[PDB]
RNA sequence: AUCGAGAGGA
């Protein structure tokens, strides 16, 4: 475990890390002392002989240099001490141990390594200071702060080895992770606070600031966009200048809780051809969200374009925020006099409620709830009463916060802070708890020697009425310290137990690998799964799509999907097709549309059998929503001209498309049924959206566009298939163990103790429960 | 330890010139001038003066890293207008403005007491 | 230096928790984190 | 007078000049105060050789304090940079050599002020090298304190430099700087609880401008052209010459670009 | 351990104002806020240089060698 | 670090010209992010800055003692008497441009501490240094010019990445690779190999 | 419990139902009771479902309990990762713990088993039982310092 | 390259939706029924109070980069005192021969009601919005 | 402290005793020491087991009689609803250790933050002793210009923190600026 | 055991080249390119041995084969000409 | 090279 499964290595480095907004995503700032120390063996060719001879001439004391020269004899020429470090003549086939240089592939690591995304390859950028520089949008997969954290660096020593870093372990390749099937990187904490303030309707930018912001985008085309305001003064909106970093052909639609197309609260997000329309950009758009900007750009444009997208969003927003400014003071914690008076009114009326229940319980007039004691009914009611007061008075403060309140702006952008931080700072930190209950009678029948015995009041049992702004009393201070100590014990306990959980998960699943027959097996050849994930798809190219056959009335399903050519009221209108009048009454084609409608009926019954609750949004391989918008833009589609798609074109085209979604290729009835079972959910999504009425009426595709959608779907499906050799068991164990390490906290055992019960199968469970219907 | 010498903020190294002029790609009559060993003192003053000449279409400066004292200036001018002449007239207009500033201060200084 | 001369140790039933009886005799806040949290105390 | 930036000296002293800068763009007024902090030259100590040190302080401790001592730099332009002069290490054309010896003869505490520095090299008749003394008692900056029996003997070579290389070469302490005291341009968004007018105090420069009409609309096409500065000098260079050499070093930086263009 | 020569934030010289400050407190029976303003220290960045300074050197001289 | 659990390292160093500035010419010795404030609820950090600002401006001492009647409103009444904004905000100007900042900055003195963790005590890089005796592996410790540990927790990540050759290279070429001779009958390392 | 149910019109609607939750469990005598739905009874004790309702019913009950552990803390892991864990704990016919007496008692390689826990005791028994290590394990090649059958190393490369 | 729409509106409602420079406007059309207007207007530049009458115009023109206005040589296409530029993104059929057009002037939005303009107002990148006194 | 009847409960320590204590402090006349408070029975030593039988007051204002318009910025104290006092606390802030007595306003901080700073105070740099030039220590680390803090605890006087400090009153801006 | 090969017909594995066999092929070429093996593409100012192999792969000039092993010891040989790179 | 404690990072 200490010299074979892991060992100390040469060509390693370690130092403190810091952030660099002017670095790239897959770049790493390397100190020149380290770059002078670490070497790479480069064999001389005609393509490097002139450069390598200069590096030897530069020597090992200043960068870019070299430290050793290896001949065919195999003896190293120490360039520090050799008398012939001036008259070297590099014969071909020799090795030159040059310095680490710019754009070299190196492995960057942050410990504990609970992730494949904790050890991923970076590009060298030699920097003139003593720290490892890295982009801010790579901190989240490392869980790396800049308060003194350290990171490691490993240097490959052969061309085969550098290939694995650049082509497998590179940073842009790990942006959209198989763990949680979503991107793990995103805009964070200054870009995030800035990209909200930039993208308000009230934020307009003048000409002088726009041109600096425009030239700050590296791959800019030189075209100055036309200002959104022209006549009184040429102003650009913040939405305008931000859209220059977004590539063309990006479509993003999201509706947030009030989002008409007029969008009065400026919420939601519509992005049309790389230019945003009416959305304020915040964490839901630009964070590490499912179906965000990063998720779209990585899938549509690619990893390299998305890695460029991080820096371009950062270089524009960090520029604007540097000349805008943003602070936070104690004034951002103060609510109004009227608001503070109503807050202490809210606490007083809840303390009177505890007094009345206490007087009720004292006269034995309490009715005990079923299955619990008289005291347990009392404790449950008082904790509920005091938590109601802390939450209501906190919401009384959060409503009072203005839009200029800087704590609110970080909350509104989602960069840092929550509601409870506002509540505990400005209104009431609230009830403290040890071991789930209130503060125990550590003394005989009291909590502190400043109380009389048998005192169950909020003050006695550890309710902190004051906020951090108002200042805690000495009793409030001690009870807060008593609960706060418990969190420090829980943090130290859960970190040690989860590290054992993650190691146990890994060591059991370390040999589970997808083989070339798509079977998920182990070293013995035993089948764990016959198809990986039961469907054979790499979780990186998987996202949530709605199966919209599940929901709606039986009439609305009929109104949207049924085509009756033998009817005149329920037929395809001649507006939708060049054959609108020719096709009416066709018997040989209505048998096709009755065949298609029978599968949509059969699939809808099948999907309700699987998803009993009626949930439509489920992770599926190929995002068909985006391919339709891609078709409406590539082939410029008007919704007035009729299509040229035959009934036979759509129906027999989709059935031919399903024949080409291959996951397994065996020519026998078992594998063909394994294949037909593995693609059933996707073909349920395929027929629901490539149905005849939906294409001709809602999409209005041409035959050119329809054949293009069929080509993309077949292409994106085959890319989403798992690659044989994928060590999916280690990936499975780390995808569970890492979010377990972030677990930290109504009578059921949950979280880390329950996960320890499940993995270490508990013959004596802490909370067995039976759910009876 | 790793920190560079402080004179590199203003002292040109070996093989380094003060200005480097490079033609812009996909931008007609536009140029990118790499100013070496300078900072926002010069770049913000040159750029703001290029905005006052009404034959200049684009003027912007940026420091690609605070580690290194250098910046890039991009100028785009009208057809038949070398941006170097736009840079020359902007630089010369800075000097004549500072020349009058120096004279008007020395006039008001000698008028004062204490 | 003053903190080290007033440091206590408990060599090893909830010992690491801040007890009510610790009032005024031991510091509520001053203790190490992680390993030996709550066992090492300061007067 | 002359066509361009207008200056109105409101208050002037040996140590402070409060003036108004009219008809200037924001970039020129900003690049004026930037170059006043950073890039105008000054003489200060850049090498200390310590013969004997029996003090309670380290040599590098005292050597760092010696660099912060304000020396005279009125005629600094007649002195050359040591990197530019053709000497071996330093000379009288490029450096000023100072001597400091002190012994704790008294039973009481013996103080080492900067008045005790002795100029050794030939000044060649220019106002340079002299440590600035603004104390009313004539003593300098309190460099060290000696007990009886402690001595300190060192030599300081003062060279020429700017505050970009080290902050000891800064002739200015603080450049006050304010434009638009009424926020009529709306260049900032005032944070407030109840009323922005009551929670923020009036600037002194508000008395030197017209208040806006609350019924009048936003003067959107206006720009910043009137600035309010107050320059303070440490003493190494007089206050008028901090801003004049500030202007002159600024236009020398622009003129080097013209010479660079003519060479390419 | 001994008075800083200049203020850290702006660079105003404060090394000459130490003995005048101690005499302003004791000989003239002044409070620290008026003695700081008397020495021309108006900005609080310069004010904390003198007001928060601990003259540890006076106890370093008490050791005999 | 400050006195409220707010720890951080120096990410950059700016001069006074590049640094933002108030109209008085006062310049920060330190800039911290507002995002270290709200998640940690270190309100006393911001009350310290408000109290230290009034004490410096008035020449008195700041009574930051626990369990007192020192209120933020009482301090802000004193700061407003000194002609500053009561909650400590100050209009600051961008040092790169001279244009004002749109937001006003929380600005004042705050007692900061220099911790024992400096970078040049942590820098390490090996590139084939000295080895141990028993295991023929790199030695432990940066004082001994050792190697960083490619532990089994890291072996996990290279397996999940699928990088077999890098995993083999760290285990062999950057570490204790060795050649032995074995017999074809019994699979033991008991063969005498006279090489020359 | 609120519950979504298909309406006769076709929509899903909120049809609330009274549900009993207990403080203890032994399922063998609970579902055989009138008035209940014995097709919908549920236990957090998946070990009972394995021995009462079968292994595959225990398999789905095993996943559902892990899923609640993740989702209650706001997180989200994909199905394939948790299901791969559950299938490894199930494919031996019964519940196999991730424990030194558990997965580490299987017929895998001795060098692979010795890398987790009970290191020398595994190698001691393997020396006596005359165990043959296939060296298909990833840990066997990490010990041997060879290119393991992992990704890049899952095949061979030959000439054309 | 000419005018696409012209009408005269009367503002019914002005809405500062937690903003300081932008109010969302609600304007009813005279000279025609079934035609209402909703628009985000910079009130810091062009103030709009209630019960005002605003001549609203939409043009196709009068890509290539924006040149700054050389003062007198460049002939304006606007005798108006407020001009914006935007992009159409949605067309809404309210009723049979009733239509709605959505524009986005960099995040300032536009809603236009009517029935007759089916020839004009194509789903185009080109949209200039002109407002008279 | 010791409360007794005087009946009406009152602190045994009176202001005449404080004047004699401070007369001894200024004289630096039958010096009035700590033991003079102990031997005159005004101050008792209570351990953890004996304080199970006592009722402590939090401040001598808890022995004041009762009788509205209170300052809304002050914190919320509770009327104790208890009157059988036998002791009073000397000062509530005396529950803290040496390192936690450096923390300014720790009643306005959440509890693990005071725990962290109490551990980081031992990592702060300053003058550990005035004879560091005479000692030959394996490692020594002295600040050039130590400063006494502008915000001080009243328990700093006995800990000699204003005499041997460990930091500097830096001018701090809380601001986003260039993203570094 | 003895010659458990699969014919060129009845090959059931994926025709698309996996990311794990792309990285090995590019690394194996860039290894021997670095040791002065002949290059089968007109390098258009390309010096990096990896970018040579990436240009050699995009023109299918790599004379290697992929022996994809199956869990029963059987194997399918696939030339780099046959495999699809997407 | 073996033990022992202190600390950093979560
Ligand atoms: Mg950290
Ligand atoms: Zn010279
Ligand atoms: Zn100062
Ligand atoms: Zn043998």
UniProtKB/Swiss-Prot annotation, chain A:
Q: What does this protein do?
A: DNA-dependent RNA polymerase catalyzes the transcription of DNA into RNA using the four ribonucleoside triphosphates as substrates. Largest and catalytic component of RNA polymerase II which synthesizes mRNA precursors and many functional non-coding RNAs. Forms the polymerase active center together with the second largest subunit. Pol II is the central component of the basal RNA polymerase II transcription machinery. During a transcription cycle, Pol II, general transcription factors and the Mediator complex assemble as the preinitiation complex (PIC) at the promoter.
The protein's organism comes out as Saccharomyces cerevisiae (strain ATCC 204508 / S288c)
The UniProt record lists the Glycyl lysine isopeptide (Lys-Gly) (interchain with G-Cter in ubiquitin) crosslink at 359
Spell out the subunit comment. Answer: Component of the RNA polymerase II (Pol II) complex consisting of 12 subunits. Interacts with DEF1; the interaction is direct and serves to bridge RPB1 to the Elongin complex in a DNA-damaged dependent manner. Interacts with the Elongin subunit ELA1. Interacts with the Elongin subunit ELC1. Interacts with ASK10. Interacts with ESS1. Interacts with RTT103. Interacts with SHE2.
The gene for this chain is: RPO21
The entry's free-text remark on domains says:
The C-terminal domain (CTD) serves as a platform for assembly of factors that regulate transcription initiation, elongation, termination and mRNA processing.
The full protein's residues present here are 337 to 1119 of 1733
List the protein's name: DNA-directed RNA polymerase II subunit RPB1
Superkingdom field? Eukaryota
From Swiss-Prot, chain B:
Where located? Nucleus
UniProt KW keywords: DNA-directed RNA polymerase, Nucleus, Transcription
Outcome of mutating residue 108 to K: Transcript termination readthrough. Lethal
Its main subcellular localisation, reduced to a broad class, is: nucleus
Named from the GO MF annotations, one term is:
DNA binding
| Gene3D superfamilies according to UniProt | RNA polymerase, RBP11-like subunit (3.30.1360.10)
Please give the InterPro entries that the UniProt record associates with this protein: RBP11, RBP11-like, RBP11-like_dimer, RNA_pol_Rpb11_13-16kDa_CS, Rpo11-like
Kindly list the GO CC terms recorded for this protein. Answer: nucleus; RNA polymerase II, core complex
Q: Which domain of life is it from?
A: Eukaryota
Question: Per the UniProt entry, what are the Gene Ontology biological process annotations, in alphabetical order?
Answer: RNA-templated transcription; termination of RNA polymerase II transcription; transcription by RNA polymerase II; transcription elongation by RNA polymerase II; transcription initiation at RNA polymerase II promoter
State whether it acts alone or in a complex, and with which partners, per the record: Component of the RNA polymerase II (Pol II) complex consisting of 12 subunits.
The family database entries (HAMAP family) matched by this protein are listed as: RNApol_arch_Rpo11
Question: What does it do?
Answer: DNA-dependent RNA polymerase catalyzes the transcription of DNA into RNA using the four ribonucleoside triphosphates as substrates. Component of RNA polymerase II which synthesizes mRNA precursors and many functional non-coding RNAs. Pol II is the central component of the basal RNA polymerase II transcription machinery. It is composed of mobile elements that move relative to each other. RPB11 is part of the core element with the central large cleft. Seems to be involved transcript termination.
Q: PANTHER family given for it?
A: DNA-DIRECTED RNA POLYMERASE I,II,III, DNA-DIRECTED RNA POLYMERASE II SUBUNIT RPB11
Misc. remarks from the entry: Present with 4280 molecules/cell in log phase SD medium.
Gene for this chain: RPB11
From Swiss-Prot, chain E:
Instruction: Identify the main location.
Output: nucleus
PROSITE patterns registered for this protein in UniProt: RNA_POL_N_8KD (PS01112)
- Tell me the residue numbers annotated for binding Zn(2+): 7, 10, 45-46
Q: Which BP terms from GO are recorded?
A: nucleolar large rRNA transcription by RNA polymerase I; ribosome biogenesis; RNA-templated transcription; termination of RNA polymerase I transcription; termination of RNA polymerase III transcription; transcription by RNA polymerase I; transcription by RNA polymerase II; transcription by RNA polymerase III
Q: Which GO terms describe its molecular function?
A: DNA binding; DNA-directed RNA polymerase activity; zinc ion binding
Keywords attached to this Swiss-Prot or TrEMBL record, sorted alphabetically, are: DNA-directed RNA polymerase, Isopeptide bond, Metal-binding, Nucleus, Ribosome biogenesis, Transcription, Ubl conjugation, Zinc
Q: Briefly state the protein's biological role.
A: DNA-dependent RNA polymerases catalyze the transcription of DNA into RNA using the four ribonucleoside triphosphates as substrates. Common component of RNA polymerases I, II and III which synthesize ribosomal RNA precursors, mRNA precursors and many functional non-coding RNAs, and a small RNAs, such as 5S rRNA and tRNAs, respectively. Pol II is the central component of the basal RNA polymerase II transcription machinery. Pols are composed of mobile elements that move relative to each other. In Pol II, RBP10 is part of the core element with the central large cleft.
| Recorded family membership | Belongs to the archaeal Rpo10/eukaryotic RPB10 RNA polymerase subunit family.
Name by which UniProt lists this protein: DNA-directed RNA polymerases I, II, and III subunit RPABC5
UniProtKB/Swiss-Prot annotation, chain F:
The stretch of residues making up the signal peptide is none
Start and end residues of each C4-type zinc finger? 183-196
List the subcellular locations.
Nucleus
The annotated subunit structure for this chain is: Component of the RNA polymerase II (Pol II) complex consisting of 12 subunits.
Q: In UniProt terms, what function does this protein have?
A: DNA-dependent RNA polymerase catalyzes the transcription of DNA into RNA using the four ribonucleoside triphosphates as substrates. Second largest component of RNA polymerases II which synthesizes mRNA precursors and many functional non-coding RNAs. Proposed to contribute to the polymerase catalytic activity and forms the polymerase active center together with the largest subunit. Pol II is the central component of the basal RNA polymerase II transcription machinery.
User: What family is this?
Assistant: Belongs to the RNA polymerase beta chain family.
Q: What is this protein called?
A: DNA-directed RNA polymerase II subunit RPB2
Q: Which species expresses this protein natively?
A: Saccharomyces cerevisiae (strain ATCC 204508 / S288c) (Baker's yeast)
Q: What is the lineage of its organism?
A: Eukaryota, Fungi, Dikarya, Ascomycota, Saccharomycotina
Q: Which gene encodes it?
A: RPB2
Q: Which residues of the full protein are shown?
A: 981 to 1176 of 1224
């Amino acid at each position: 475990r200490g010299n074979l499964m892991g060992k100390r290595v040469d060509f390693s480095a370690r130092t403190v890390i810091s952030g660099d907004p002017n670095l790239e995503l897959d770049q790493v700032g390397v100190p020149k002392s380290i770059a002078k120390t670490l070497t790479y063996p480069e064999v001389v060719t005609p393509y490097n002989i002139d450069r390598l001879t200069q590096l030897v001439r530069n020597g090992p004391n200043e960068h870019p240099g070299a430290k050793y020269v290896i001949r065919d004899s195999g003896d190293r020429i120490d360039l520090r001490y050799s008398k012939r470090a001036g008259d070297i003549q590099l014969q071909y086939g020799w090795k030159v141990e040059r310095h680490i240089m710019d754009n070299d592939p190196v492995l960057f690591n942050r410990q504990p390594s609970l992730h494949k995304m904790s050890m991923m390859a970076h590009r060298v950028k030699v920097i003139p200071y003593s720290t490892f520089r890295l982009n801010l949008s790579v901190t989240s997969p490392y869980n790396a702060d800049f308060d003194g954290d350290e990171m490691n660096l490993h240097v490959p020593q052969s061309e085969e080895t550098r290939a694995e870093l650049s082509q497998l372990c590179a940073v842009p390749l790990q942006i959209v992770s198989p763990q949680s099937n979503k991107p793990c990187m995103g805009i964070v904490q200054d870009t995030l606070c800035g990209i909200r303030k930039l993208t308000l309707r009230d934020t307009f930018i003048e000409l002088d600031q726009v041109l600096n912001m425009l030239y700050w985008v590296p791959d800019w085309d030189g075209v100055i966009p036309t200002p959104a305001i022209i006549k009184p003064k040429p102003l650009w909106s913040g939405k305008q200048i931000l859209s220059v970093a977004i590539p063309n052909g990006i479509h993003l639609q999201r509706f947030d809780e009030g989002t008409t197309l007029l969008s009065p609260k400026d919420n939601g997000m519509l992005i049309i051809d790389g230019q945003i329309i009416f959305g304020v950009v915040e964490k839901k758009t630009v964070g590490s969200s499912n179906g965000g900007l990063i998720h779209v750009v990585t899938r549509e444009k690619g990893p390299q374009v998305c890695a460029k997208l991080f820096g371009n969003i950062q270089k524009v927003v960090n520029f604007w925020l540097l000349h805008n400014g943003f602070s936070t003071g104690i004034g951002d914690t103060i609510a109004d006099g009227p608001t503070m008076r109503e807050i202490t009114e809210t606490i007083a009326e809840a303390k009177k409620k505890v007094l009345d229940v206490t007087k009720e319980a004292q006269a034995n007039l309490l009715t005990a709830k079923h299955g619990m004691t008289l005291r347990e009914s009392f404790e449950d009611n008082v904790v509920r009463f005091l938590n109601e007061a802390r939450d209501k008075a906190g919401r009384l403060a959060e409503v009072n916060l203005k839009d200029l309140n800087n704590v609110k702006q970080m909350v509104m952008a989602g960069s840092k802070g929550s509601f409870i931080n506002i509540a505990q700072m400005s209104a009431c930190v609230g009830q403290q708890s040890v071991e789930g209950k209130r503060i125990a009678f550590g003394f005989v029948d009291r909590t502190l020697p400043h109380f009389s015995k048998d005192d169950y009041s909020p003050e006695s049992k550890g309710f902190v009425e004051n906020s951090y702004l108002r200042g805690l009393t000495p009793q409030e201070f001690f009870f807060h310290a008593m609960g706060g100590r418990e969190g420090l014990i829980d943090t130290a306990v859960k970190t040690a137990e989860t590290g054992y959980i993650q190691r146990r998960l890994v060591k059991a699943l370390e040999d589970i690998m997808v083989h070339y027959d798509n079977t998920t097996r182990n070293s013995l050849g035993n089948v764990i799964q016959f198809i990986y994930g039961e469907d054979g798809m790499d979780a990186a190219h998987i996202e949530k799509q709605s199966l919209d056959t599940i929901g709606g009335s039986d009439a609305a399903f009929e109104k949207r999907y049924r085509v009756d050519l033998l009817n005149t009221d329920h037929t395809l209108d001649p507006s939708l097709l060049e054959s609108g009048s020719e096709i009416l009454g066709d018997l040989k084609l209505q048998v096709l549309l009755d065949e298609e409608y029978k599968q949509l009926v059969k699939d809808r019954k099948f999907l309700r059998e699987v998803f009993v609750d009626g949930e439509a949004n489920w992770p599926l391989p190929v995002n068909i929503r985006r391919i339709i918008q891609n078709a409406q833009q590539t082939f410029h589609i008007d919704h007035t001209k009729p299509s040229d798609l035959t009934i036979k074109d759509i129906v027999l085209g989709v059935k031919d498309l399903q024949e080409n979604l291959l996951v397994l290729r065996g020519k026998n009835e078992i594998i063909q049924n394994a294949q037909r079972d593995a693609v059933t959910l996707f073909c349920c999504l395929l027929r629901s959206r490539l149905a005849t009425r939906r294409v001709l009426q809602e999409y209005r595709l041409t035959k050119q566009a329809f054949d293009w959608v069929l080509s993309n779907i077949e292409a994106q499906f085959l890319r989403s298939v798992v690659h044989p050799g994928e060590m999916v068991g280690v990936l499975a164990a780390q995808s569970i163990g890492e979010p377990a390490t972030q677990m930290t906290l109504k009578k059921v055992t949950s979280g880390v103790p329950r996960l320890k019960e499940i993995l270490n199968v508990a013959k004596n469970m802490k909370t067995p429960s039976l759910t009876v219907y | 330890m790793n920190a560079p010498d402080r004179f590199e903020l203003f002292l040109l190294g070996e093989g380094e010139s003060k200005l480097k002029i490079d033609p812009d790609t996909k931008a007609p009559n536009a140029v990118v001038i790499t100013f070496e060993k300078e900072d926002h003192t010069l770049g913000n003053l040159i750029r703001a003066e290029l905005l006052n000449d009404r034959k200049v279409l684009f003027a912007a400066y940026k420091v690609e890293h605070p580690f290194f004292a250098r910046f890039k200036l991009r100028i785009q001018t009208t057809e038949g207008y070398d941006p170097k002449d736009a840079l020359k007239n902007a630089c010369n207009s800075i000097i004549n403005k500072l020349g009058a500033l120096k004279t008007n201060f020395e006039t008001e200084w000698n008028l004062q007491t204490l | 230096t003053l903190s080290h001369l007033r440091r206590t140790n408990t060599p090893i039933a909830k010992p690491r928790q801040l007890h009510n009886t610790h009032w005024g005799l031991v510091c509520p806040a001053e203790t190490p984190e992680g390993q030996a949290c709550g066992l090492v105390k300061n007067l | 007078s002359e066509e361009g930036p207008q200056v109105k000296i409101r208050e002037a002293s040996k140590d402070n000049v409060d003036f108004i800068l009219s008809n200037v763009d924001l970039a020129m007024a900003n690049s004026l105060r930037r170059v006043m902090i950073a890039e105008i030259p000054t003489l200060a100590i850049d090498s200390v050789e310590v013969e004997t040190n029996t003090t309670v302080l380290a040599d590098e401790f005292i050597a760092h304090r010696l660099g912060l001592i304000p020396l005279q730099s009125m005629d600094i332009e007649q002195l050359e940079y040591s990197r530019d002069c053709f000497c071996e290490d330093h000379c009288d054309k490029c450096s000023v050599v100072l001597t400091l010896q002190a012994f704790g003869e008294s039973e009481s505490t013996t103080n080492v002020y900067s008045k005790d520095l002795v100029i050794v090299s030939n000044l060649m008749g220019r106002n340079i090298g002299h440590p600035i003394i603004q104390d009313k008692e004539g003593n300098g900056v309190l460099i060290c304190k000696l007990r009886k029996g402690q001595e300190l003997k060192l030599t300081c070579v003062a060279k020429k430099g700017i505050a970009k290389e080290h902050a000891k070469w800064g002739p200015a302490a603080a450049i006050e700087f304010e434009y638009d005291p009424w926020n009529k341009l709306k260049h900032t968004d005032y944070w407030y609880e109840q009323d922005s007018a009551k929670e923020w105090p009036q600037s002194k420069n508000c008395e030197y401008e017209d208040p806006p009409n609350e019924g009048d609309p936003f003067d959107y096409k206006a720009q910043a052209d009137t600035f309010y500065m107050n320059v303070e000098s440490v003493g190494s260079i007089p206050v008028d010459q901090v801003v004049v050499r500030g202007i002159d070093t600024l236009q020398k930086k622009v003129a080097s670009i013209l010479l660079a263009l003519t060479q390419m | 351990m001994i008075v800083p020569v200049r203020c850290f934030s702006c660079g105003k010289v404060v090394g000459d104002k130490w003995e005048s400050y101690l005499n302003l407190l004791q000989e003239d029976e002044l409070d620290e806020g008026t003695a700081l303003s008397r020495l021309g220290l108006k900005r609080y960045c310069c004010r904390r240089m003198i007001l928060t300074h601990v003259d540890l050197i006076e106890k370093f001289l008490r050791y005999n060698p | 670090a400050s006195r409220h659990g707010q720890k951080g390292t120096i990410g950059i160093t700016y001069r006074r010209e590049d640094m933002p500035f108030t109209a008085e010419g006062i310049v920060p010795d330190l800039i911290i992010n507002p995002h270290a404030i709200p998640s940690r609820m270190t309100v006393a950090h911001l009350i310290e800055c408000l109290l230290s600002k009034v004490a410096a401006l008035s020449g008195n001492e700041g009574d930051a003692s626990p369990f007192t009647d020192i209120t933020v409103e009482g301090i802000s009444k004193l700061l407003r008497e000194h002609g500053y904004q009561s909650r400590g905000f100050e209009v600051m100007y961008n040092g790169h441009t001279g244009k004002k900042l749109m937001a006003q900055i929380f600005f004042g003195p705050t007692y900061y501490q220099r911790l024992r963790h400096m970078v040049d005590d942590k820098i390490h890089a090996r590139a084939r240094g000295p080895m141990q005796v028993l295991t023929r592996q790199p030695v432990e410790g940066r004082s001994r010019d050792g190697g960083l540990r490619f532990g089994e927790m890291e072996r996990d990540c290279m397996i999940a990445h699928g990088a077999a050759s890098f995993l083999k290279e760290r285990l062999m070429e950057a570490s204790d690779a060795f050649r032995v001779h074995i017999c074809g009958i019994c699979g033991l390392m008991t063969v005498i190999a006279k090489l020359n | 419990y609120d519950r979504k149910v298909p309406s006769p019109t076709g929509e899903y609607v909120k049809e609330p139902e009274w549900v009993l939750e207990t403080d203890g469990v032994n399922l063998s005598e609970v579902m055989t009771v009138p008035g209940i739905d014995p097709t919908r009874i549920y236990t957090n004790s998946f070990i009972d479902i394995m021995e009462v309702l079968g292994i595959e019913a225990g398999r789905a009950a095993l996943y559902k309990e892990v899923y609640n552990v993740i989702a209650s803390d706001g997180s989200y892991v994909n199905y394939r990762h948790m299901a791969l864990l559950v299938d490894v704990m199930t494919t031996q016919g019964g519940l196999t713990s991730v424990t030194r007496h558990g997965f580490n008692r299987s017929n895998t390689g001795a060098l692979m088993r010795c890398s987790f826990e009970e290191t020398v005791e595994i190698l001691f028994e393997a020396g006596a039982s005359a165990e043959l290590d296939d060296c298909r394990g990833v840990s066997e090649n990490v010990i041997l310092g060879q290119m393991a059958p992992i990704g890049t190393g899952a095949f061979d490369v030959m000439i054309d | 390259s000419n005018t696409l729409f012209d009408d005269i509106f009367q503002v019914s409602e002005v809405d500062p939706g937690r903003y300081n420079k932008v109010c969302r406007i609600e304007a009813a059309s005279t000279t025609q029924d079934q035609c209402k207007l909703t628009l985000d207007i910079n009130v810091e530049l062009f103030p709009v109070a209630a019960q005002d009458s605003l001549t609203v115009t939409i043009a196709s023109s009068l890509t290539r980069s924006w040149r700054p206005p050389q003062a007198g040589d460049r002939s304006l296409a606007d005798d108006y005192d407020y001009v914006m530029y935007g992009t159409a993104y949605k067309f809404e059929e309210v009723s049979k021969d009733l239509i709605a057009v959505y524009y986005s002037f960099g995040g300032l939005l536009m809603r236009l009601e009517g029935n007759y303009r089916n020839l004009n107002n194509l789903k185009q990148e080109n949209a200039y919005l002109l407002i008279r006194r | 402290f010791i409360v007794e009847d005087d009946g009406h409960k009152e602190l045994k320590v009176r202001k005449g005793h404080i004047a004699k204590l401070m007369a001894t402090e200024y004289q630096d006349v039958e010096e009035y020491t700590w033991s003079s408070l102990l031997n005159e029975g005004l101050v008792e030593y209570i351990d953890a087991e004996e304080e199970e039988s006592i009722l402590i007051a939090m401040q001598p204002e808890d022995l004041e009689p009762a009788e509205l318009d209170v300052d809304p910025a002050k914190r919320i104290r509770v009327s104790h609803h208890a009157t059988t006092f036998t002791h009073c606390e000397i000062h509530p802030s005396m529950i803290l250790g040496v390192a936690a007595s450096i923390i300014p306003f720790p009643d306005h901080n959440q509890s693990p933050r005071n725990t962290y700073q109490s551990a980081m105070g031992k990592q702060a740099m300053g003058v550990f002793l005035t004879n560091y030039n005479v000692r030959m220590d394996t490692m020594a680390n002295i600040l050039y210009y130590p400063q006494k803090p502008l915000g001080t605890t009243r328990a700093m006087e006995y800990l000699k923190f204003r005499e041997l400090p460990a930091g500097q009153n830096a001018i701090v801006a809380i601001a986003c600026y260039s993203g570094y | 055991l003895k010659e458990k090969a699969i014919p060129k017909d009845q090959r059931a594995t994926t025709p698309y080249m996996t990311k794990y066999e792309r990285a090995r092929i590019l690394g194996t070429r860039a290894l021997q390119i670095s040791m002065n093996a002949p290059v089968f593409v007109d390098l258009e100012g390309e010096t990096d041995p990896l970018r040579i192999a990436m240009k050699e792969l995009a023109e299918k000039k790599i004379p290697l084969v992929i022996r994809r092993y199956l869990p029963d010891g059987s194997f399918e040989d696939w030339s780099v000409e046959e495999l699809i790179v997407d």
